[PDB]
Amino acid sequence: FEELTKDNRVLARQQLEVLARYLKYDLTKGEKSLVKEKEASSLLQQELDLWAEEHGEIYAQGIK
């Protein structure tokens, strides 16, 4: 029963690829840039756990 649910979904997905190639509109531009912003946001957490390792949490709120 699962074998004919899938083949219409394979055809519809494959028709979505060619329609996007015609439009010059790529599907995963957000998913490609989100992983380029989970790296810039991981070099800020690497730096913030340095300041929080040298100075504790009581120093961290006292300098506000």
TrEMBL record:
<comment type="similarity">
    <text>Belongs to the thiolase-like superfamily. Fungal fatty acid synthetase subunit alpha family.</text>
</comment>
<protein>
    <recommendedName>
        <fullName>Fatty acid synthase subunit alpha</fullName>
    </recommendedName>
</protein>
<comment type="function">
    <text>Fatty acid synthetase catalyzes the formation of long-chain fatty acids from acetyl-CoA, malonyl-CoA and NADPH. The alpha subunit contains domains for: acyl carrier protein, 3-oxoacyl-[acyl-carrier-protein] reductase, and 3-oxoacyl-[acyl-carrier-protein] synthase.</text>
</comment>
